[PDB]
């Protein structure tokens, strides 16, 4: 992207703010902090449609192409965030004495 | 020193066996040796599966009719009707309420109450043992493991049956008894184990096979699945989540991928290590090299999948065996065919072998759910069944609902390419190899890789002659014996097969049950004629024989009769068709030369300038060459007497075959016998008609043998029979012989009674290994007590022969074998067994007939003596044979379906 | 020969190695580490079982009522009637119903539609994993296997379907579910297997998960077996063909012996190899040795028993462990006892083991089934339970109903004697070992031999002198977490405990939740106290902290605050009783001492001599050493910062934090610049007036001859000494004035314009190196690396304004949240609260602290870790503690609810 040039935090913390608030409009509600980075997305209410949504309203986010099926390989906001980084950036005897 | 050099060879013989005992225990490749399978649409063998895969199409029907079920308000388009399908159509096998109870000893209620999954795993289970080429009850006492895929689907659910003391409701429904049912009725000790894992059942059941084999607690085991639907209710279930495809067709990896359609089914597969497999000598089809397991895990949800399972799966499955992706061909992938399932597997299969893969060589990718559907528990293992028949006919079929690839997987890397058409898979160079994935709903993956069979080279010693070829077909009722000669003379019929691997295939891989026949043949046409006639209901030919017994091995006495059993040609060309036969005439001959000039051979083969059948100083010789040499012929096929009895002179040979004696002194002491037999030639007369009736009538004139009730032959003497043969004149006196002046028996025998003893007093008995219950005296003696003294009393003393019969029937033997080139004493051995108590189940059997004696003959009265009982080694019969493919078991069948 | 030497060497290694290899791969001894068991009777954990066996008793009891059976219709004393039962007695849970959804992340509807046995499998996998002395969430993502034995028994089939578009009925009632839901809600990743075989199932699954320990597929293994009873069903078929006692027991070899008794029970077992038991550290109760399976075969009837095939297993089983009959002390026979399963059985162990055994030692039989019941699937597991229970105590429990011995076998030829009365089996030099039998309805047969730990318990140090010792709590829900405390406090007020071994089991035997608490106490009054306090509701205690969290983790950034918080002595006894800080404090002594002639440590400890904390040439260096110090301290326990902000000089202490700076450069800059800054003393003040930066920008227009903007409305100075008592006076209603002890300088003023020169040269010799850690400069209001903190750069941090307004919001809003204040006392908190409340970012930023003006103990600033901790942070606790024995703690206390489903 763009924006590059900073702290791994910094990167890990944007990609999560838009990964969460990407999936904040598909749920439904227009806030981030009813989103958490841990619980799964089958628990939030996630489907098959809205899945695929989701993956749509990231390509138009950052601009690059993602897998149909990027939902159930990575099933939580971090993962997907962390996904979304990744991507872009003498002897003889007492020895031979094991034969017997 | 020198020693240093000794201990480095045996520290390296060490070595290199603890290595060859790693890999064993790591690693060993297992080999399959035969394979069954049930599936929807009248497929009942992996011939007619392969026949459907290669044209290409499904079995997908209408619902059932028999089972039921309420097709009327089952069924409702809108999908939100509580208990209703918005689908209805589904692959379901053809008869699924057919089984035949009395072949495996069940009771009709047990039947009933009998799940319909136990019922076919059973009969699957014995045409799996059958078609591999083993005897059925050759497996009983070994160590045989079980491993099935089964679950419970609700059977029987809707019934109240109070009256089941037995308690046949619980254990007909039970998992584990799926699997303890067969190991009790097939009789294995092997681990019997039932596990359910989602619909990768069979892949784990595989594995935990493929363990227990390695580590050796079993030599066998039957691996599979099984699945059969007995209520709606699955179909109910899904139709409320929209998961199935509204026309019922799975397209995996298409571009509609609507949902699944479900079906049934059972398969099994038989495994064994190869190295066993070699040695006992059975088919391969295919080698199983490694296998791995693993859990999905967190994921996004309990039901989705995840691909870095899978990925890890394969990777495992890789490593393990010791290959490196590349040398895999093709992978049959699960292909459930959802919306979104297909796309992970694909993409997972592209990352774990697309990557750094030949753009010439692309990895080939289709699934078998595409014809017939996914058949629930059963699904992984048979799709290995379609791996295997690929690794066989030498093609992969196609995949159906293709030419649309599903867009979400990217396939411009070129790493995977689908199956459009049959591609050729002919052997070459490379190893072919091939992978089959199973991913359940629990969240068990599996993956295992399977390899092409190694290379037999010619095993084809044919020599198919005009020798003789027995046919023997058994079964445990007259209608499946109908049944199984029609199939035989079916399978004959085809211009393609040899009568001696027919014989050998009938003879050494099928049962023996209780209804048997036989059939004699040295052409196909005769074959075929005499298996139509037994078919029919009617058997007329003496070529044909029949018969019902109900054990499995009888005591056999081997009895020798006396004389009038003479015919010229005794055996004769039998002399040139048997080694055995030939061998024991030579070595008599020897025996006997340093005798006699003339030979016994060409007397039996009507050689010029040699004595004919009319003195008994030559007589009595070739009888007795005649009779050891049918008895060691008898022995020769697995036949081996438990006491030998003897009527007059034969007792000699009676001896022979006890080992009481030997060859020369046997051949001295009938030589001697028969030359003072010729100097007593001016009086005699033998004569057949109760003892008291002979005593009454027998005080004018101044008894040899007694046979039964009513036959008693007298002494030999011309003026005091003379008389006698007309003074009864009340049926008394009418049978005669020839016995020219023989008097055997008779005060007469007495006259010298020096000359034998002389001449014989030179024989060196030895203890006998078999009972000798004599007829001069009602007792068991040993070879210790056989003197001349004995010999003498023998010719002199009464040989009674009802008695010594009725004290073997009552002691316990029931099988008597006659052994003479004619049956003269059969009749009278019969009626005394009637007579007397014993067991209602003797069988008396004769030998070569005076109108026989070629070795057809000899085969007839061995087929007539084993559909009674006694066994027999017919292998023995056909030497250098190849054994065929013969047809499974023709079932009776028989509908079990528990009605609400 | 030297070559032939080497090469003889290397093949015998070779050859060592590849035995070894074939004895592990063959058998490779497994070790129990830990064990779980719910049983009728309210029997839920281990040591009541054992308390029961001991003393002596039963379970029976009547049929459950609150299931929704027909008690009426059921019973019916003739045992003909159809769907009636001759029997009211049998083994049943306390409280099957039970389940606590919201700790699982299941839906209550979920919940409803569940198998009782998935929830009891469950709650008895968490409380199995948490009695091994093992985290829970360390095992997520490892190679841990289940296997377990289980069935269907007939729950919610009575009912009605509804809407199910989840589909949560068919996963609910599924057996593989069972075992593939353990593995999902822990996060493990090995092989999971729902075997099925009659009675011995359990057993069955243990056999198949050695073969997976020995290979290598699993690293550990959770093997068990359930069986609880929805329908009477059982009951009623087994009455119609009356193959159950008249009085509901199960006389195991007794003359009266007439039929089984049914019970419910789930059990589980926790396995793992025994070489990797002694890596990791983890307890081993019993040794796992052999096992065997074989088949009845061919034999009278499909459900009778045969003895040639147990015998076959039994000698199988010894000869795959290694071992002779002669050296197994007690069997645990399978002892259904009905009609004629015990004739059969003790021939075959009369026949195997009896044989030619010494009449001193004659093998002790027994059966657990005389004491709580068939418990079908879950019956091999505990016969294993009770025979490691009888293991670890040292003693045989003896079997009940054994007044009159079965008369249909020999029992005075000699060999195996019952075992009638209370046996003791203490500890020799010989090695007790016992086996495990299990022979199913199907025609399965297993054998199990198991044996003795090995003493390893003779290690420990249990060393305690009195420092202060944290307790944390955690729970998923506050009713937990008061049950938690409530545990914890009870568990404290006996007296054979220990605090360092609580402290150090709690901070790593057990997991971390939403809902977190600590207390902080040197004595078990104090902490008994503390948990009381937390137990009883809002504990207002200086102690006791408490919070609520969401986040694993933060990104913790260190804040610098400079002077203006002096007080005298800075952890005395903390410099005493902590080893790092004494070490970091000497350690910058070395470069000190060339420039000066006290030491920082005599001004700390109040020593003769100090100059006192009175003249800036001294405060400034002595406020560097502790603020350095702190932060050092701060690194252990593991509280790596991401970003580091200061305010004043104190900026080149957070210069020596991330790296920039080394401690030679650091101490000469400080001690110069205090130098050439005491040496003008005597110029103004600062004099800071919380006005608004607006309001003082508009203001100092009579006086042109801003230092600081921390605050929305906060700044300093501008101006001259005369200026500034001009503008303490001026306005007379803007108030707040002064409030600044700082009056012997003034810096960032005109007046800093005059030892420019001095400066410069005084510090010349820095070596910037590059910082390992985001610097975040406040007064270039920018992140730079390290490479250009020249003495240019210092000089314009002298001569320049400082914000810490600016640079803490786009700290909050780059992302990070956690704020440290690395200080001898808090003085910028306020203003950080401040500037992160005004702040666009994630509204649960924490700030903390560090020692106070009074509370400069070590227990004061554990303290504070506490209340950093609670809120989201890292912080590793055993550290704390250092060298300690952990002790045992229960288990999480459940909320369980009713989630039964009825016609």
């Given at each position: 992207?763009?924006?590059?040039?900073?702290?791994?935090?910094?990167?890990?913390?944007?990609?999560?703010?838009?990964?969460r608030?990407?999936?904040?409009?598909?749920?439904?509600?227009?806030?981030?902090?009813?989103?958490?980075?841990?619980?799964?997305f089958?628990?939030?209410?996630?489907?098959?449609?809205?899945?695929?949504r989701?993956?749509?309203?990231?390509?138009?986010?950052?601009?690059?192409?993602?897998?149909?099926?990027?939902?159930?390989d990575?099933?939580?906001?971090?993962?997907?965030?962390?996904?979304?980084?990744?991507?872009?950036?003498?002897?003889?005897?007492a020895?031979?004495?094991?034969?017997? | 020193?020198?020693?240093?050099?000794?201990?480095?060879?045996?520290?390296?013989?060490?070595?290199?066996?603890?290595?060859?005992?790693?890999?064993?225990?790591?690693?060993?490749?297992?080999?399959?040796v035969?394979?069954?399978?049930?599936?929807?649409?009248?497929?009942?063998?992996?011939?007619?599966?392969?026949?459907?895969?290669?044209?290409?199409?499904?079995?997908?029907?209408?619902?059932?009719?028999?089972?039921?079920?309420?097709?009327?308000?089952?069924?409702?388009?809108?999908?939100?009707?509580?208990?209703?399908?918005?689908?209805?159509?589904?692959?379901?096998?053809?008869?699924?309420?057919?089984?035949?109870?009395?072949?495996?000893?069940?009771?009709?209620?047990?039947?009933?109450?009998?799940?319909?999954?136990?019922?076919?795993?059973?009969?699957?289970?014995?045409?799996?043992?059958?078609?591999?080429?083993?005897?059925?009850?050759?497996?009983?006492?070994?160590?045989?493991?079980?491993?099935?895929?089964?679950?419970?689907?609700?059977?029987g659910?809707?019934?109240?049956?109070?009256?089941?003391?037995?308690?046949?409701?619980?254990?007909?429904?039970?998992?584990?008894?799926?699997?303890?049912?067969?190991?009790?009725?097939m009789?294995?000790?092997?681990?019997?184990?039932?596990?359910?894992?989602?619909?990768?059942?069979?892949?784990?059941?595989?594995?935990?096979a493929?363990?227990?084999?390695?580590?050796?607690?079993?030599?066998?085991?039957?691996?599979?699945?099984?699945?059969?639907?007995?209520?709606?209710?699955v179909?109910?279930?899904?139709?409320?989540?929209?998961?199935?495809?509204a026309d019922?067709?799975?397209?995996?990896?298409?571009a509609?991928?609507?949902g699944?359609?479900?079906?049934?089914?059972?398969?099994?597969?038989?495994?064994?290590?190869?190295?066993?497999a070699?040695?006992?000598?059975?088919?391969?089809?295919?080698?199983?090299?490694?296998?791995?397991?693993?859990?999905?895990?967190?994921?996004?949800?309990?039901?989705?999948?995840?691909?870095?399972?899978?990925?890890?799966?394969?990777?495992?499955?890789?490593?393990?065996?010791?290959?490196?992706?590349?040398?895999?061909?093709?992978?049959?992938?699960?292909?459930?065919?959802?919306?979104?399932?297909?796309?992970?597997?694909?993409?997972?299969?592209?990352?774990?072998?697309?990557?750094?893969?030949?753009?010439?060589?692309?990895?080939?990718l289709?699934?078998?759910?595409?014809?017939?559907?996914?058949?629930?528990?059963?699904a992984?293992?048979?799709?290995?069944?379609?791996?295997?028949?690929?690794?066989?006919?030498?093609?992969?079929?196609?995949?159906?609902?293709?030419?649309?690839?599903?867009?979400?997987?990217?396939?411009?890397?070129?790493?995977?390419?689908?199956?459009?058409?049959?591609?050729?898979?002919?052997?070459?160079?490379?190893?072919?190899?091939?992978?089959?994935?199973?991913?359940?709903?629990?969240?068990?993956?599996?993956?295992?890789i399977?390899?092409?069979?190694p290379?037999?080279?010619?095993?084809?010693?044919?020599?198919?002659?005009?020798?003789?070829?027995?046919?023997?077909?058994?079964?445990?009722?007259?209608?499946?014996?109908?049944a199984?000669?029609?199939?035989?003379?079916?399978?004959?019929?085809?211009?393609?097969?040899?009568?001696?691997?027919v014989?050998?295939?009938?003879?050494?891989?099928?049962?023996?049950?209780?209804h048997?026949?036989?059939?004699?043949?040295?052409?196909?046409?005769?074959?075929?004629?005499?298996?139509?006639?037994?078919?029919?209901?009617?058997?007329?030919?003496?070529?044909?024989?029949?018969?019902?017994?109900?054990?499995?091995?009888?005591?056999?006495?081997?009895?020798?009769?006396?004389?009038?059993?003479?015919?010229?040609?005794?055996?004769?060309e039998?002399?040139?068709?048997?080694?055995?036969?030939?061998?024991?005439?030579?070595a008599?001959?020897?025996?006997?030369?340093?005798?006699?000039?003339?030979?016994?051979?060409?007397?039996l083969?009507?050689?010029?300038?040699?004595?004919?059948?009319?003195?008994?100083?030559?007589?009595?010789?070739?009888?007795?060459?005649?009779?050891?040499?049918?008895?060691?012929?008898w022995?020769?096929?697995?036949?081996?007497?438990?006491?030998?009895?003897?009527?007059?002179?034969?007792?000699?040979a009676?001896?022979?075959?006890?080992?009481?004696?030997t060859?020369?002194?046997?051949?001295?002491?009938?030589?001697?016998?028969?030359?003072?037999?010729?100097?007593?030639?001016?009086?005699?007369?033998?004569?057949?008609?109760?003892?008291?009736?002979?005593?009454?009538?027998?005080?004018?004139?101044?008894?040899?043998?007694?046979?039964?009730?009513?036959?008693?032959?007298?002494?030999?003497?011309?003026?005091?029979?003379?008389?006698?043969?007309?003074?009864?004149?009340?049926?008394?006196?009418?049978?005669?012989?020839?016995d020219?002046?023989?008097?055997?028996?008779?005060?007469?025998?007495?006259?010298?009674?020096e000359?034998?003893?002389?001449?014989?007093?030179?024989?060196?008995?030895?203890?006998?290994?078999?009972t000798?219950?004599?007829?001069?005296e009602?007792?068991?003696?040993?070879?210790?007590?056989?003197?001349?003294?004995?010999?003498?009393?023998?010719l002199?003393?009464?040989?009674?022969?009802?008695?010594?019969?009725?004290?073997?029937?009552?002691?316990?033997?029931?099988?008597?074998?006659?052994?003479?080139?004619?049956?003269?004493?059969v009749?009278?051995?019969?009626?005394?067994?009637?007579?007397?108590?014993?067991?209602?189940?003797?069988?008396?059997?004769?030998?070569?007939?005076?109108?026989?004696?070629?070795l057809?003959?000899?085969?007839?009265?061995?087929?007539?003596?084993?559909?009674?009982?006694?066994?027999?080694?017919?292998?023995?019969?056909?030497?250098?044979?190849?054994?065929?493919?013969?047809?499974?078991?023709?079932?009776?069948?028989?509908?079990?379906?528990?009605?609400?």
């Open positions: 992207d763009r924006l590059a040039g900073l702290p791994r935090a910094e990167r890990t913390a944007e990609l999560v703010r838009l990964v608030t990407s999936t904040a409009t598909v749920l439904g509600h227009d806030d981030p902090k009813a989103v958490r980075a841990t619980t799964p089958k628990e939030l209410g996630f489907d098959s449609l809205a899945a695929v989701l993956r749509n309203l990231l390509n138009a986010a950052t601009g690059l192409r993602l897998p149909s099926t990027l939902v159930f990575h099933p939580n906001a971090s993962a997907v965030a962390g996904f979304l980084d990744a991507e872009l950036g003498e002897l003889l005897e020895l031979g004495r094991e034969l017997d | 020193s020198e020693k240093v050099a000794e201990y480095l060879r045996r520290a390296t013989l060490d070595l290199r066996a603890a290595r060859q005992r790693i890999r064993e225990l790591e690693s060993d490749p297992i080999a399959i035969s394979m069954a399978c049930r599936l929807p649409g009248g497929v009942n063998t992996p011939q007619r599966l392969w026949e459907l895969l290669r044209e290409g199409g499904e079995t997908l029907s209408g619902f059932p009719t028999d089972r039921g079920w309420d097709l009327a308000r089952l069924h409702h388009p809108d999908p939100d009707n509580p208990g209703t399908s918005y689908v209805d159509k589904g692959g379901f096998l053809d008869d699924a309420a057919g089984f035949d109870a009395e072949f495996f000893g069940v009771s009709p209620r047990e039947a009933a109450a009998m799940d319909p999954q136990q019922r076919l795993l059973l009969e699957t289970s014995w045409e799996l043992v059958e078609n591999a080429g083993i005897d059925p009850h050759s497996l009983r006492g070994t160590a045989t493991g079980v491993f099935l895929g089964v679950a419970k689907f609700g059977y659910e809707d019934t109240a049956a109070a009256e089941d003391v037995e308690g046949y409701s619980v254990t007909g429904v039970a998992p584990a008894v799926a699997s303890g049912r067969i190991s009790y009725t009789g294995l000790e092997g681990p019997s184990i039932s596990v359910d894992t989602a619909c990768s059942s069979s892949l784990v059941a595989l594995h935990l493929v363990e227990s084999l390695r580590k050796g607690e079993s030599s066998m085991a039957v691996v599979g699945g099984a699945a059969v639907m007995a209520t709606p209710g179909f109910v279930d899904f139709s409320r989540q929209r998961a199935l495809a019922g067709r799975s397209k995996a990896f298409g509609g991928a609507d699944f359609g479900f079906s049934e089914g059972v398969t099994l597969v038989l495994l064994e290590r190869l190295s066993e070699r040695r006992n000598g059975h088919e391969v089809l295919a080698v199983v090299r490694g296998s791995a397991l693993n859990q999905d895990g967190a994921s996004n949800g309990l039901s989705a999948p995840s691909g870095p399972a899978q990925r890890r799966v394969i990777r495992q499955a890789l490593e393990s065996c010791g290959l490196e992706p590349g040398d895999v061909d093709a992978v049959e992938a699960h292909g459930t065919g959802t919306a979104l399932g297909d796309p992970i597997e694909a993409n997972a299969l592209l990352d774990t072998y697309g990557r750094d893969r030949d753009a010439d060589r692309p990895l080939w289709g699934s078998v759910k595409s014809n017939i559907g996914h058949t629930q528990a059963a992984g293992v048979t799709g290995l069944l379609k791996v295997v028949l690929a690794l066989r006919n030498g093609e992969l079929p196609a995949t159906l609902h293709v030419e649309e690839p599903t867009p979400h997987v990217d396939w411009s890397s070129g790493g995977v390419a689908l199956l459009a058409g049959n591609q050729p898979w002919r052997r070459g160079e490379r190893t072919r190899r091939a992978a089959v994935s199973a991913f359940g709903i629990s969240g068990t993956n599996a993956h295992v399977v390899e092409e069979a290379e037999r080279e010619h095993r084809e010693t044919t020599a198919h002659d005009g020798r003789p070829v027995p046919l023997v077909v058994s079964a445990r009722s007259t209608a499946a014996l109908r199984q000669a029609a199939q035989i003379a079916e399978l004959l019929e085809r211009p393609d097969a040899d009568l001696a691997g014989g050998l295939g009938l003879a050494t891989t099928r049962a023996r049950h209780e048997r026949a036989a059939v004699v043949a040295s052409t196909r046409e005769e074959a075929v004629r005499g298996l139509r006639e037994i078919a029919a209901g009617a058997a007329t030919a003496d070529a044909v024989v029949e018969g019902v017994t109900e054990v499995d091995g009888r005591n056999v006495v081997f009895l020798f009769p006396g004389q009038g059993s003479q015919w010229a040609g005794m055996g004769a039998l002399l040139s068709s048997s080694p055995v036969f030939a061998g024991k005439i030579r008599c001959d020897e025996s006997m030369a340093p005798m006699q000039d003339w030979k016994v051979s060409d007397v083969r009507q050689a010029p300038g040699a004595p004919g059948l009319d003195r008994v100083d030559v007589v009595q010789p070739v009888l007795f060459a005649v009779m050891v040499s049918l008895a060691e012929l022995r020769s096929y697995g036949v081996e007497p438990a006491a030998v009895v003897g009527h007059s002179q034969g007792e000699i009676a001896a022979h075959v006890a080992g009481a004696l060859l020369e002194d046997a051949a001295k002491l009938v030589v001697g016998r028969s030359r003072l037999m010729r100097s007593l030639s001016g009086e005699g007369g033998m004569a057949a008609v109760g003892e008291a009736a002979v005593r009454e009538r027998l005080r004018p004139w101044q008894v040899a043998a007694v046979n039964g009730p009513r036959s008693v032959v007298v002494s030999g003497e011309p003026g005091a029979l003379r008389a006698f043969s007309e003074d009864c004149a009340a049926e008394g006196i009418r049978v005669r012989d020839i020219v002046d023989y008097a055997s028996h008779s005060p007469q025998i007495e006259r010298v009674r000359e034998l003893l002389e001449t014989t007093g030179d024989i060196a008995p030895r203890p006998a290994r078999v000798f219950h004599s007829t001069v009602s007792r068991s003696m040993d070879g210790t007590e056989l003197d001349a003294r004995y010999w003498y009393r023998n002199r003393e009464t040989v009674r022969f009802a008695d010594a019969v009725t004290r073997l029937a009552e002691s316990g033997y029931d099988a008597f074998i006659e052994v003479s080139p004619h049956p003269v004493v009749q009278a051995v019969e009626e005394a067994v009637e007579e007397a108590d014993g067991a209602e189940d003797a069988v008396v059997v004769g030998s070569l007939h005076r109108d026989g004696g070629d057809s003959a000899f085969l007839r009265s061995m087929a007539t003596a084993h559909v009674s009982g006694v066994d027999i080694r017919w292998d023995v019969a056909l030497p250098g044979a190849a054994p065929f493919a013969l047809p499974t078991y023709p079932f009776q069948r028989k509908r079990y379906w528990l009605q609400p």
